[PDB]
Nucleic acid binder design. Structure first.
Lengths: 102, 159, 58, 245
RNA sequence: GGUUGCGGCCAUAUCUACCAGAAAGCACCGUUUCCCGUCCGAUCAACUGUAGUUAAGCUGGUAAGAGCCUGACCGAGUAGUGUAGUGGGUGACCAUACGCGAAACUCAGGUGCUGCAAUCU
RNA sequence: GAAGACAUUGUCAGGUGGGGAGUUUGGCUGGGGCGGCACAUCUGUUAAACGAUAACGCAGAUGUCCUAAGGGGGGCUCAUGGAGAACAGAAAUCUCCAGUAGAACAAAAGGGUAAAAGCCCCCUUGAUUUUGAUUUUCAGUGUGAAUACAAACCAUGAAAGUGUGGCCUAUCGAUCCUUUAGUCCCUCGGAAUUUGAGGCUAGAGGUGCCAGAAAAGUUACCACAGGGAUAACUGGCUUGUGGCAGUCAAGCGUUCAUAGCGACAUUGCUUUUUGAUUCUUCGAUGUCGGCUCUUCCUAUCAUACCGAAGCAGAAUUCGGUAA
RNA sequence: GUGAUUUCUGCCCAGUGCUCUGAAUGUCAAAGUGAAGAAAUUCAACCAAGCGCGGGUAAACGGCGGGAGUAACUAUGACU
RNA sequence: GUCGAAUUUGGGUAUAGGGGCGAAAGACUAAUCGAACCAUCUAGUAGCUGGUUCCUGCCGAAGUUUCCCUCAGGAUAGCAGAAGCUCGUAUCAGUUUUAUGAGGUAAAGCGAAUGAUUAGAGGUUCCGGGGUCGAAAUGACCUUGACCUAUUCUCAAACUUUAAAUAUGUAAGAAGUCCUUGUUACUUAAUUGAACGUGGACAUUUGAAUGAAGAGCUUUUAGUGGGCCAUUUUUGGUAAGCAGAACUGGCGAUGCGGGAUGAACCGAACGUAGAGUUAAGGUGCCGGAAUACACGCUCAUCAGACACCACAAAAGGUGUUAG
RNA sequence: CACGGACCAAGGAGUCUAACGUCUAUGCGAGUGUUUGGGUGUAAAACCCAUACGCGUAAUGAAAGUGAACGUAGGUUGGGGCCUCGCAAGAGGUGCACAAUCGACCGAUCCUGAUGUCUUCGGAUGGAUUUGAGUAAGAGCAUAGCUGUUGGGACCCGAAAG
């Protein structure tokens, strides 16, 4: 699919509360960032004798992640997320579609 | 496997008609729906928005909510041993009035008319309907009319 | 070991032992679902006529 | 007896090749009938020994896995031969001829220390992978495959047209003029504002300027393989080029 | 009664074929500076009601016409069906009792009806 | 004597390690396996004119694609056929007349639509924000989807209007954990500031066995709880099949339908073959064949008495009473 | 591992095992060193064995198919 | 069989249970061996099989929905018992008439739209959808086929103008009608509408039939979650006492009289007794009751005799009887 | 022609405990519960008592926190009774319990932000198709009984194993 890089949508940032111009980028997961409470509980329980104490997932079936777009206001810089349907191809910007060609 | 979609088994129920295709006539929109009026549901195949589920085709309920495009309709549906009370939001294409209610409203005007005239007359109101009664005895005049004797017919093939 | 998968036999006879009975539909039905522009007006019209009868008629 | 052939792919490329190859050697003579199914076809063989003749033929030309089962018919008393009706279930490996394939980390280190991000070339008796950037070949026998099966990342259906500009050969060749740098652009991005991709490919010697090549375009795809997720996203190339025309 | 704008019911109003239509209204018909739209003032725009006409549109009439719509002791109480029998039959099924009741056809008739405002020897 | 700040010994870390330990090895099912998914779903039909309705019933589809193929307005009309035109024909481009939708509408099938929901341009982001009510599967819980409003901000249109994603019916996901956005708000419990970690509100990463376990085999050395709810021997129901018998008489028997063979249609019997079923027995009916021994049936191989012949004798064939 | 003797024990080192006096910078933990930071920490570099590459090995486990052509035809247990 | 040796044997002495010992059988290790014997944790766990102790009285089930590594089981909804509470002609009903809607099944239709299926002959840039090689693309080979190219026949669960019977939705009035004018931030050009109101009028025919051992609401828990049969409609199957559905009635839980006998068939449902009449079924005798009455038919060297039901067909007869 | 039962006597199977659910009996009542312990005693009985503690009288929020009358503790519709009228039939007034409905109050979310102000703290007032197991002239605590639920050897008997 294709989305344009700039989209005008609603903003709720206590100064605008109305439609302003937004820049669009793509969601990136982020590093695991240990010292988290899940990881500190996990590292303690794994250490010792007994081996694997938590489930290890194998049977994965889906083929597409959903697309999340973070939307940044240009005036007040208040970010906002917005999702789409599933797709195998996702790109943004180029190749405006042209119906009639050779 | 099985199939239980929102418009399954509606091949012949949601067809439009023979020689009634096209946009609906504009007297459908012009009718007036007040709270409490009795309505019948008949799902127009043309307008997909605000369209009743296949169960409610032919049921009859009450107007309780009136909004821009649509009317609020309550229908009693049975499930288990029980009557539920279910609310719908149907656009004005699908809905239509019921003449059985409208003919009652004229009969109330007939009943109130008889009572005031009978009171000035001063006896014998007789307001209730009656079912059909067995007919009275009468004489049939054979003058110019003699009985015609019949007989059973014999068998012929003519195949 | 196959089993009889589904039957509706003896279902309607179980239903009519207690009574289908109607929900018996009291006066003043609930305004849940009514157009909220109409409910917002209907609040004040009752508050007007209760104040109107109170002062004028006693 | 019955030899049940199956393959778990929506677009079977390997199975179409078998039907052409089953004709030339004339392996089916002992068929009674042929039925079809969802993801393969069934063969019916009158005697037990004729069924075994086919699987020894399928072992040589296509990577398979098979197992047998039976059921009673007659329950003979005097002789003892109780007339078991057999069934052979043959499964084709779901990796096609040009699948873009991401290998597991333990498996890729075991064969040739290959990178995990490879193509496929030799769909014959054992499945053979090729690294398009720096050329290197590695095989995968079915006994190594079926003990820990995986899938293909993409298929032969997401291929995108590309237009070649010039061929810059580094020089090293295994047998088909390896590691030639190719400047390329999509058919889409050419008429519109200028986008140029520059990438190595094995398709160096056979490729000239102005020739359309098919290929995988990675950068616009959200894949969902955990094997792919355990990669280093700044080492994965943007364009992998598969074939000419 | 004729017309015109605006409708409602949407073939009794359609389709096909010819033939008429005073008065007024419609309608074709004259042009290109402005507005605008076009490859083309053909459609749409604009201007004149002047130079021209009922030949078309439209309306009305005609047709053992096609269609369509109403009625029928028309087909017919036939087809089909609900309920009942220790009814018949080897079976297939068919009678009877209490009830409901079609369609195709055939025949006879029909060929738009009206609301609001305006306008005409 | 030899060795020497190395070996050895002591803790931690990586590799190796069926030599050993612990455990696991789906479900539906005309027995179980193999295959299939009828395991989450969608159209037509089965379906017996509301709804509901089963089978491993039938013909099929989905885990996608789309900044247009979404939203608003404007203009136009399609499949195919007739008659015309240098190169030009079966089919290029152009022109008129006919044309109830026979074309098109991302895909299965079924609906739907003609001054449009189709084709071609024009401007565009309502595919947004706050959160409730209702419909469908339903326990009237979820998830998915869908309708109708309200309170805001916008788009298009001259305007009335329509617009909360694909014309409608399928296109998808809980707790725990990691992550982002928002409030820049709340807590770190002796009192503070800055890092860090923990909360509220809302999205994402996924469980396809799809209301969501982390999981390879064999036993003919076998064990226990049970099951005729479920197979293997007989019985019973059924007779496609096998056996066997009638009707029609094709071919024949040089020339002659029926002395006699009898293909092929069609009507039947029986349980001497095999299938189909799973009613009875799995807290056991001792499950093949032969040797020995009695009785019964007739669809008659031989004997007795007859009938017909293409029966001269002889030798046979058909058939009757007959066990 | 085969199982007296008389006789023989063919061809295959690639798959799986075994081993290597072989080449080194691909993989690579703890401790140590280097940078950033107020500090917790974060990042990078070097990085032993084995793995990976290269060599040997069948009286180790084991395996031992097919195809097209060659003076007209024929095509071989032959040359290719 | 072997019997002068890998011979046979006494006493001594070693090796102990995941261990011993084995010229190898998973053998032997105190009648115990594919993991001994004894005690304890131990009354180990079981969706699995068997048992479960006095009497009478009243009421009285279900084998179905959704979900579960669920199909011998649970959870929930169902039906059921008990405790009662509020009130007592309230207003209701497995039903009819009257009014009015909705449906595409039987039957009709093909001289109305649509219409298969059986077989399938040609057309080397009128396409390619694939497969293989390819130091390439003037690129080869191999193959489904593109394409039906003049026709010829068929009806319909997956075809439609028309369209029943049975079954189904709502209405048949007091919470109603009419008159008058009050409320508001909603709505309208407008005290126009909208909803809810004050005041006044309309009563026993207050708005069809018929019935009502009261109507309405709450709490709380037992059992059950293997079903089965027949008339009728049906689906796969040659067919079944076969597998799977629909509507009602019964067996399961149920005796009694009738079918000789039998869970379902016909009649009829049960406190203990007396008398009268009956149901289905019977009246030669067993066997209670007419060897009644009335008109006819049939002679069988395999007669015939009573629904379910314990079977028989096509085809022949100058046997007789009536047409 | 499924399984147990040769005969007889005696033994033999839904028990108890903790914390609870509905219902019922009794005391007391915005309270209630003496019995851990002390006083006394005809002595494991009976009798008597302090102070705390327990649930209850206020919810809500994730938390820091805040924290229930515009009014005869609201209007409407029914409503058992009683009162007034009537000779009755009926009419009217008042209507507790409970059922239906629109409101007000408090907390959470969301929004508006008055005087002030250590200029960023303070949140007056008015809101909203939202939300809570809330208030609206208290109903609970303690004991006992039937039944039902859970953990216990849990109705009794039974494995192959570890």
């Amino acid at each position: 699919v294709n989305v344009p890089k700039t989209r005008k949508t609603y903003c709720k940032g206590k100064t605008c509360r109305k439609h302003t111009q937004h820049k669009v980028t793509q969601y990136k997961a982020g590093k695991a960032s240990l010292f988290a409470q899940g990881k500190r509980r996990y590292d303690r329980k794994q250490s010792g004798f007994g081996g694997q104490t938590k489930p290890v997932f194998h049977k994965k079936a889906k083929t597409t992640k959903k697309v999340v777009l973070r939307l940044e206001c240009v005036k007040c810089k208040t970010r906002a997320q917005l999702t789409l349907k599933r797709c195998k191809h996702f790109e943004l910007g180029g190749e405006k579609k042209q119906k009639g060609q050779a | 496997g099985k199939s239980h979609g929102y418009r399954s088994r509606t091949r012949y129920m949601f067809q439009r008609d023979f020689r009634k295709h096209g946009a609906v006539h504009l007297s459908t929109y012009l009718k007036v729906y007040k709270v409490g009026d009795i309505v019948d549901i008949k799902a127009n195949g043309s307008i997909q928005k605000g369209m009743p589920h296949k169960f409610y085709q032919g049921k009859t309920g009450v107007v309780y909510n009136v909004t821009k495009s649509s009317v609020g309709v309550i229908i009693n549906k049975m499930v288990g041993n029980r009557y539920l009370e279910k609310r719908l939001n149907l656009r004005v294409e699908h809905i239509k009035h019921s003449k059985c209610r409208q003919e009652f409203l004229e009969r109330v005007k007939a009943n109130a008319a008889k009572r005031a005239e009978a009171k000035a007359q001063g006896v014998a109101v007789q307001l209730k309907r009656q079912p059909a009664q067995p007919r009275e005895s009468r004489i049939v005049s054979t003058e110019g009319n003699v009985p015609q004797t019949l007989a059973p017919v014999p068998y012929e093939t003519f195949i | 070991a196959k089993s009889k998968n589904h039957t509706a036999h003896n279902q309607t006879r179980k239903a009519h032992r207690n009574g289908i009975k109607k929900p018996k539909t009291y006066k003043y039905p609930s305004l849940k679902g009514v157009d909220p522009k109409f409910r917002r007006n209907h609040k004040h019209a009752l508050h007007g006529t209760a104040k109107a009868l109170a002062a004028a008629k006693k | 007896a019955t030899v049940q052939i199956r393959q778990k792919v929506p677009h079977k490329r390997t199975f179409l090749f078998l039907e052409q190859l089953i004709l030339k050697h004339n392996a089916h003579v002992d068929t009674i009938s042929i039925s079809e199914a969802k993801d393969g076809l069934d063969f019916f063989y009158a005697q037990k020994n004729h069924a075994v003749k086919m699987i020894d033929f399928l072992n040589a030309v296509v990577p398979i896995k098979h197992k047998k089962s039976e059921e009673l018919i007659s329950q003979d008393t005097h002789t003892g031969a109780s007339t078991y009706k057999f069934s052979y279930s043959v499964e084709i490996v779901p990796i096609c001829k040009d699948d873009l394939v991401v290998l597991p980390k333990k498996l890729a280190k075991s064969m040739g220390n290959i990178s995990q991000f490879v193509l496929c070339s030799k769909i014959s008796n054992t499945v053979q992978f090729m690294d398009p950037t720096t050329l290197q070949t590695a095989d995968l026998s079915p006994s190594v495959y079926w003990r820990a099966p995986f899938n293909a990342l993409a298929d032969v259906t997401q291929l995108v047209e590309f237009i070649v500009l010039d061929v810059d050969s580094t020089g090293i060749s295994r047998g088909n003029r390896v590691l030639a740098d190719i400047t390329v652009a999509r058919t889409s991005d050419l008429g519109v504002n200028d986008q140029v991709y520059y990438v190595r490919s094995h398709l160096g010697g056979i490729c000239h300027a102005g020739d359309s090549v098919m290929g995988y375009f990675i950068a616009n795809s959200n894949y969902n393989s955990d094997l792919f997720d355990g990669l280093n996203i700044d080492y994965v190339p943007d364009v992998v080029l598969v074939k000419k025309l």
